[PDB]
Amino acid sequence: ICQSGDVLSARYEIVDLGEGAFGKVVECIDHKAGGRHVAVKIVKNVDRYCEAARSEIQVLEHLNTTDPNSTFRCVQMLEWFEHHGHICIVFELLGLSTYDFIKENGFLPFRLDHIRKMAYQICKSVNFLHSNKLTHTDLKPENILFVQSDYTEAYNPRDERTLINPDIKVVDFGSATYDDEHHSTLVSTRHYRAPEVILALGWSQPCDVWSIGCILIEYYLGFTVFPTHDSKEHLAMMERILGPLPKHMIQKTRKRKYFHHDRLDWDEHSSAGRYVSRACKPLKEFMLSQDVEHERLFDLIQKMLEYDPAKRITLREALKHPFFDLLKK
Numbered sequence: 001i002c003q004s005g006d007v008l009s010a011r012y013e014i015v016d017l018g019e020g021a022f023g024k025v026v027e028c029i030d031h032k033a034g035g036r037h038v039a040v041k042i043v044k045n046v047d048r049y050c051e052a053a054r055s056e057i058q059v060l061e062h063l064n065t066t067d068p069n070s071t072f073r074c075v076q077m078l079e080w081f082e083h084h085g086h087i088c089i090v091f092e093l094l095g096l097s098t099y100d101f102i103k104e105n106g107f108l109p110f111r112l113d114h115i116r117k118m119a120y121q122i123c124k125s126v127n128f129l130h131s132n133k134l135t136h137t138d139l140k141p142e143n144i145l146f147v148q149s150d151y152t153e154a155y156n157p158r159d160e161r162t163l164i165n166p167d168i169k170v171v172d173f174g175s176a177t178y179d180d181e182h183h184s185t186l187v188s189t190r191h192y193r194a195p196e197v198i199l200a201l202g203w204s205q206p207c208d209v210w211s212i213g214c215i216l217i218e219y220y221l222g223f224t225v226f227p228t229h230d231s232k233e234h235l236a237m238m239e240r241i242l243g244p245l246p247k248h249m250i251q252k253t254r255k256r257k258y259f260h261h262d263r264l265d266w267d268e269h270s271s272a273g274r275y276v277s278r279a280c281k282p283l284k285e286f287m288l289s290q291d292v293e294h295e296r297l298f299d300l301i302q303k304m305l306e307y308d309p310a311k312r313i314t315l316r317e318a319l320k321h322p323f324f325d326l327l328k329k
């Protein structure tokens with residue numbers, strides 16, 4: 001399936017957007033909504049993804065009927081159907097993901113004024129899930145999309161792309177979990193995974209706040225501050241960047257394998273040791289300016305990466321953070 005010219009459910013004519021673990025997202029003309037263009041997510045016919053897609057449709061029926069005008073900027077689902085035993089989800093058509101924009105921008109960062117608007121809308125959208133006893137669990141730049149990704153290009157003492165409109169929506173509700181629903185041990189894409197998740201101390205709304213903080217650094221720098229595919233390495237990077245893990249979380253965790261007594265079981269002089277030393281350093285040292293508005297973002301990021309998820313700032317508090325004052329003038 002998934003070639004252009006193909007028609008899905010005698011309605012959606014494929015014209016073009018993105019592969020992934022789940023399957024494919026294609027652009028389609030809706031021949032039965034005045035030729036409106038739509039995005040259609042074709043999901044692998046694989047138990048893990050079938051489950052997740054059935055679950056995403058459930059969550060999207062709720063979010064879309066709770067918020068029919070999309071004030072809280074969750075992507076609108078139009079319809080869903082089966083095509084050769086594949087689940088297909090039809091959504092409003094957005095622009096590039098923030099990940100795909102950054103990449104197409106030569107992995108250059110967003111300017112600060114754009115990060116402020118985007119940060120605000122992310123916190124607003126996700127806080128809305130948090131109000132409805134939902135946790136996203138998988139926030140990341142790939143899953144934040146521009147409503148519209150049109151740009152202007154211009155040189156800079158390196159060629160640069162700036163968004164005309166930085167408005168975003170949030171997508172992928174396939175991992176989203178209700179407060180009372182069963183809570184998987186593994187959640188999030190490693191680089192955006194909260195410490196309560198790695199340590200299997202149980203997680204909720206706060207694991208989204210950690211993810212967002214990670215997203216905000218990535219937008220600021222153009223790269224992740226956790227460039228890793230290993231759990232222990234991840235905890236070690238957190239240490240050099242955020243300070244020691246709390247006493248209590250280390251001694252609660254059944255994830256004892258990561259520990260030698262009460263210290264992280266970490267060789268400084270081994271290959272990965274040397275990597276963490278060189279590539280990681282105290283968070284505030286990644287600042288590109290000492291400007292107040294830079295200091296203000298960084299104060300918010302630091303709160304979002306509070307180790308203890310109880311102490312971790314909530315998105316309700318995050319929206320009243322100073323960094324957003326400029327938006328209220």
Ligand SMILES: COC(=N)c1nc2ccc3ncnc(Nc4ccc(OC)cc4F)c3c2s1
Nearest residue numbers: 018020025039091092093094097099142171172
């Ligand atoms: C792109 O136009 C859209 N309306 C989309 N609507 C949805 C709805 C659900 C989606 N659920 C998961 N992913 C989506 N996109 C996606 C984002 C970044 C990627 O690589 C960097 C790959 C992707 F496929 C989705 C998209 S993309």
